[PDB]
Structure formats: C-alpha cells, structure tokens
Design a binder for this molecule. Structure first.
Ligand SMILES: [Ca+2]
Length: 240
C-alpha cells in the first residue's frame, strides 16, 4: 500500500496472506479474505501460476513469529469461468480457495462480511485498502499489514477520459486517485473494506493499478466489485 499507515494487530481479522513455496521458503504473493472457516476469496490472477500455495491466517508481521498464525494448505482453487489472463480489464478477477482444514476462529481469525448483490457505493464512500504489498512504486513489500484511506470514485467519473476511460467496467470499483495513496504490487487479491450501516464489509478485491505507477494522480486503484459476484460465490461453496 503506498501512503499507508500500519494496521493494528486485530483490526482486520479476515485478511489472509496467500503465499507460495519458493525453494525451501514460502513467499507472500497476494492477499485475500477468509469468507468461510475453510474458504478464502482472492483475485483470479493471483493463482494463475501453478505453484504450491498456502494460506496464513492470524498474520500481522510476515517475517517474525506473532503467536497467532494458523498455516493451512490449499486443497482446491475455483477461478471464475470467465476470467481471462490476457484481459484483466474485462473483469472477472476473482477466485475461491478451499482449505485443507477449517481454521479456528478467534479474535485474530474471523470471516469477512460480504455485501448484498447489486450494492453500489456512492461517490466518495469511505473505504480502507489493506495489505503487505509495495510501499512505493517499484519499492519493497511491507513487513507489517498496512492500510490506506481510499474514498470511492464512482463509475461515471472513473470511466471519464482523464481517469481510466474505457478500462473500467461497471463490475469494478475505483478508489483513491489522489496521487499519494494507492494499492500497489502485492496487495492484489486483498480486500477493500467499506463502511455501510455501521458495519465494514468487503466491497472490492484488489485487481490493478496503472503501469505508470501505483500512486498516479487521476488513476485510482481498481477492484473487482464483490456485489456483482454474490450468487457465484454461494454456488461454488454449496457444491465443493
Ligand atoms: Ca509472522
């Protein structure tokens, strides 16, 4: 997250670290949201390479013991049928991961709340992006969970010529674009948490930033809009 503050150890308990095995080590690649005791939601592009993946829950500092972490293997990946690797701009950037164990829920490990289907956030709705991703463009991953305040930019404005124009679809949410604060490389698959009726719900899955840089004036971070995919998520969980 560029222009972020460090998150409190227990403020975002559905945030997971998606990691893959590199050599003998494991390495963070993406975020995700625990949505069931045995199911994670992440971006489809995060599971495009055929790697061994694990999900870590109760995670705060990647490279120090925290006393909270449960480490569970991935048993099944269900990416969206319509996802296409060569066209992130088409949308559909969402995947569900079935875990090989239900995890123990506790104050560090909780299920993320999903919105209703059809829900559109109004322009400038308050939302937080969370993750361990890069802190500068071409920078370095954060050791500790970071968060940034990222108000929504509605469709009309985000699909306007000077912002993203045609790249953003109605199945996406745009947030940020002030030139200072953004998602960045590493944060993908993770949540955008927005306040609705006094409750935080995960409204976005981090999909992309600009190739010019993570924090660009007039180019907001773009997220898969979870509300468009509610039936799909439930249909997958009822059959796997
Ligand atoms: Ca740790």
């Amino acid at each position: 997250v560029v222009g972020g503050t460090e998150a409190q150890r227990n403020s975002w308990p559905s945030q997971i670290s998606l990691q893959y095995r590199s050599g003998s080590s494991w390495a963070h690649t993406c975020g995700g949201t625990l949505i069931r005791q045995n199911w994670v939601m992440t971006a489809a592009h995060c599971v495009d390479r055929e790697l061994t993946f694990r999900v870590v829950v109760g995670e705060h500092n990647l490279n120090q013991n925290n006393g909270t972490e449960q480490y569970v293997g991935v048993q099944k990946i269900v990416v969206h049928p319509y996802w296409n690797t060569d066209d992130v701009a088409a949308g559909y950037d969402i995947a569900l991961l079935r875990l090989a164990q239900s995890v123990t829920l506790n104050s560090y490990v909780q299920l993320g709340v999903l919105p209703r289907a059809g829900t559109i956030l109004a322009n400038n709705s308050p939302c937080y992006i969370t993750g361990w991703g890069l802190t500068r463009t071409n920078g370095q991953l954060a050791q500790t969970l970071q968060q940034a305040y990222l108000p929504t930019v509605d469709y009309a404005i985000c699909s306007s010529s000077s912002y993203w124009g045609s790249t953003v679809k109605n199945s996406m949410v745009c947030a940020g674009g002030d030139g200072v604060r953004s998602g960045c490389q590493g944060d993908s698959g993770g949540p955008l948490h927005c306040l609705v009726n006094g409750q935080y719900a995960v409204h976005g899955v981090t999909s992309f930033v600009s190739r010019l840089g993570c924090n660009v004036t007039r180019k907001p971070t773009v997220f898969t809009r979870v509300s468009a995919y509610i039936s799909w998520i439930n249909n997958v969980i009822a059959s796997n």
